[PDB]
Design a binder for this molecule. Structure first.
Ligand SMILES: OC[C@H]1O[C@@H](O)[C@H](O)[C@@H](O)[C@H]1O
Length: 123
């Protein structure tokens, strides 16, 4: 069981986005038998937002995972799942360094593995 979560390399400049803009990339893997994964936002990120130091909250979205009220999830039994979190076109993105904190969970439902994730994306 390993997890990789990091900010993307594309530069974001403040203002009103025209397009879906990549912000973080996630990799969740385990050779063990499993049903799927949760990605649960934690702390300030509750609600599924990245949050800057001045308290600006920006929505995260992904096309690789589903969403259930307050968390991403997917049924995927393969050894490895990748996801990109992006900012939707049309959102205004203001000042600073935006942190997302979360907890990744592997389930079979019973959770059999869990790990904190954290990364900071610059605007
Ligand atoms: O099948 C199990 C899955 O069911 C979904 O409805 C739920 O949002 C996921 O977190 C996971 O528990």
């Amino acid at each position: 069981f390993s997890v990789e979560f990091k900010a993307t390399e594309n530069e974001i400049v403040s203002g009103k986005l025209d397009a879906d803009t990549p912000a973080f990339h996630l990799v969740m893997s385990d050779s063990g038998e499993h049903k799927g994964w949760n990605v649960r936002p934690t702390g300030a990120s509750e609600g599924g937002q990245m949050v800057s130091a001045d308290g600006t909250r920006v929505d995260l979205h992904t096309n690789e995972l589903s969403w259930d009220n307050d968390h991403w999830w997917i049924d995927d039994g393969s050894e490895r799942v990748e996801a990109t979190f992006f900012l939707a076109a049309g959102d205004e993105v203001k000042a600073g360094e935006y942190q997302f904190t979360g907890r990744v969970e592997e389930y079979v439902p019973t959770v059999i593995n869990s790990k904190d994730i954290s990364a900071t994306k610059t605007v």
